[PDB]
């Protein structure tokens, strides 16, 4: 009673990726998921499934599967993992300590880096408190780092929260853009609709 394939291509092959701070999440349900297209490709620089068997994915049915897509630089990819610290994990995108899914990343220097510097991509540098897991904040209010209130970015202790990347093709690999896709596996007391090819409900 289910034959359509899950549109993983609409996320990985998407023309543009949303900024990391405003990470874009897509819900996936009512389809047959062929994960072997993902966990066998050699183009991915980082492929780590946390909490699940990465090879036995084609045998599992799930209630819903969520795919989050964004881009960061190379040295910040290590922050996309359960139990991590840093500007991306604390303020931009936080995974829970019991994250059940896969973390996928690959270099995109030939896509997201324009000649001279790509400032379209941004990321949060200052925030009041650390982000609870899977919290998506977009407030661009002036961050107050001192005892004096702020109205406008001028004056010390008043900064614009979002920081833009300087992605150029000449930048070092550690400072090059890396498209990241995070798969979240959710199972509830509900009809499991995201199954692998050789699943049990079939």
């Amino acid at each position, epitope marked *: 009673n289910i034959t359509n394939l899950c549109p993983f291509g609409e996320v990985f092959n998407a023309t543009r990726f949303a900024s990391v701070y405003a990470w874009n999440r897509k819900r996936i349900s009512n389809c047959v998921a062929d994960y072997s297209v993902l*966990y*066998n490709s*050699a183009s991915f620089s*980082t492929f*780590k499934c946390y909490g699940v068997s*990465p*090879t036995k994915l084609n045998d599992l049915c799930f209630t819903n599967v969520y795919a989050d897509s964004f881009v960061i630089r190379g040295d910040e990819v290590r922050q996309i993992a359960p139990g991590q610290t840093g500007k991306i994990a604390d303020y931009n995108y936080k995974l829970p300590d019991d994250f059940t899914g896969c973390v996928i990343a690959w270099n995109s220097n030939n896509l997201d880096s324009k000649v001279g510097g790509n400032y379209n991509y941004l990321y949060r540098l200052f925030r009041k408190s650390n982000l609870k897991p899977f919290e998506r904040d977009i407030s661009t209010e002036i961050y107050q780092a001192g005892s004096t209130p702020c109205n406008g970015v001028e004056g010390f202790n008043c900064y614009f929260p979002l920081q833009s990347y300087g992605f150029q093709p000449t930048n070092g690999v550690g400072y090059q853009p890396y498209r990241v896709v995070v798969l979240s596996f959710e199972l509830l007391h509900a009809p499991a609709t995201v199954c692998g090819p050789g699943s049990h409900h079939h």
Partner: antibody, heavy 119, light 111 residues
Framework: VQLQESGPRLVKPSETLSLTCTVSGGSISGSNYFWGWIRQPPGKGLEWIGTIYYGGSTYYNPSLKSRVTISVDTSENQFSLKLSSVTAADTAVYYC????????????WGQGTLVTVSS | NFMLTQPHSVSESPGKTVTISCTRSSGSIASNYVQWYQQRPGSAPTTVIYEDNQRPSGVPDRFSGSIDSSSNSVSLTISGLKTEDEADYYCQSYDSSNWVFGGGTKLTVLG
């Protein structure tokens, strides 16, 4: 109950080498595994040679991309290995192992075969 | 494009706990999974730990693997050492094009 190596042990130096790894109990046409080659000199460490997925995608060791080619045929359900222009350092016990779906750990190993290059 | 470094040799008494580190020379070790293999004298290797912490059904739970984030390395821990575990151990990882093994570790059970 799956893997076992071939029998052309002796190889003359400066010539080529050929080994085959037969897979019993399981269709190699059922491409759900990678098939790799691993060698080790007597009392030395393991070195990866190359893997092959039946979809055609091959991966070779950069130190051996000039001399190593790996094929596979479903007519007899086995994958081969070519090591051209053999040298004295290539004396090793060549294991063929099965690799699971993901590029992770080798599931099913063989028992290897020692090749020696002398005259 | 990278390598994996293992200690020369280790040694401990029976029933004790030993640790073997697998240091990566280039890149982040947390990029992909790191595995461990146990090769007894003469015979073929066998997977003990995979996915940096996972044991296949049939391997004693005495083996365990953890991560050391700062030193850019993973570690294999063997609690309750037995004389049957006296063998060579290798670590293996994959980095986007290559499967790379480590140097090796000669485990010696004392007493």
């Amino acid at each position: 109950v799956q893997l076992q190596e071939s029998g052309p042990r002796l190889v003359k130096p400066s010539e080529t080498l050929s080994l085959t790894c037969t897979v019993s109990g399981g269709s190699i046409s059922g491409s759900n595994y990678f098939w790799g080659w691993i060698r080790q000199p007597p009392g030395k460490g393991l070195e990866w040679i190359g893997t092959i997925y039946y979809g055609g995608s091959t991966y070779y060791n950069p130190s051996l991309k000039s001399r190593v080619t790996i094929s596979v045929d479903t007519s007899e359900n086995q994958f081969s290995l070519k090591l051209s222009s053999v040298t004295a350092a290539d004396t090793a016990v060549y294991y063929c192992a099965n690799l699971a779906w993901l590029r992770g750990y080798f599931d099913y190993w063989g028992q290897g075969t020692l090749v020696t290059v002398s005259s | 494009n990278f390598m994996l470094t293992q200690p020369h040799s280790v040694s401990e008494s029976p029933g004790k706990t030993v640790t073997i580190s697998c240091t990566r020379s280039s890149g982040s070790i947390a990029s992909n999974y790191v595995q461990w293999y146990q090769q007894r004298p003469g015979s073929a290797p066998t997977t003990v730990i995979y996915e940096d912490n996972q044991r296949p059904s049939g391997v004693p739970d005495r083996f365990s693997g953890s991560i050391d984030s700062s030193s850019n390395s993973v570690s294999l821990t063997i609690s309750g050492l037995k004389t049957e575990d006296e063998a060579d151990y290798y670590c293996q990882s994959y980095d986007s094009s290559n499967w790379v093994f480590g140097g090796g570790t000669k485990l010696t059970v004392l007493g």
